[PDB]
Design a protein around this ligand. Structure first.
Ligand SMILES: CC[C@@H]1CCCC[C@@]1(O)C(=O)C(=O)N1CCCC[C@H]1C(=O)O[C@H](CCc1ccc(OC)c(OC)c1)c1cccc(OCC(=O)O)c1
Length: 128
């Protein structure tokens, strides 16, 4: 499924090149430039465990998810992944636990040492 496709075909977008965050662009965005640090970003997302078990989707509640990029307001994989996106883009990310919830997890939905899959749509962003 989608997570395996990211394992096989995803680009390693980590600074360390440790495959901790792997990315596939599923829909090219028409925005010209990536957001800057501190920019307010607006996204929709789906989150699943790497085995395909869904844990959340912003669409369930018709609520864009909003945060300031590159400030540690979200798990590391998201600061890394969203920094690579263009407005209008949809990507798939596969995120090793080091770049997500680590050994603690986020119980009940996310176990210890979980690799996470996300689909992320960058709806918009605005300058810091
Ligand atoms: C277990 C699933 C998780 C449960 C809390 C709500 C979000 C959640 O359902 C989820 O899908 C998730 O895993 N998210 C939400 C979408 C962005 C990616 C990811 C996330 O980063 O959630 C954080 C969780 C708190 C957090 C912040 C920073 C961290 O490291 C720098 C971190 O490391 C483990 C953990 C999040 C971020 C912002 C808002 C969140 O909830 C709403 C709120 O607090 O207003 C939740």
């Amino acid at each position: 499924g989608a997570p395996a496709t990211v394992t096989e075909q995803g680009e390693d977008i980590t600074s360390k090149k440790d495959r901790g965050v792997l990315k596939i662009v599923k829909r090219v965005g028409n925005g010209e430039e990536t957001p800057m640090i501190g920019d307010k970003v607006y996204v929709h997302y789906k989150g699943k465990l790497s085995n395909g078990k869904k844990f959340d989707s912003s669409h369930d509640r018709n609520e864009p998810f909003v945060f300031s990029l590159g400030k540690g307001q979200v798990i590391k994989a998201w600061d890394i992944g969203v920094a690579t996106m263009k407005k209008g883009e949809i990507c798939h990310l596969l995120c090793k636990p080091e770049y997500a919830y680590g050994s603690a997890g986020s119980l009940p939905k996310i176990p210890s040492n979980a690799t996470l899959f996300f689909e992320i749509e960058l709806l918009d962003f605005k300058g810091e």
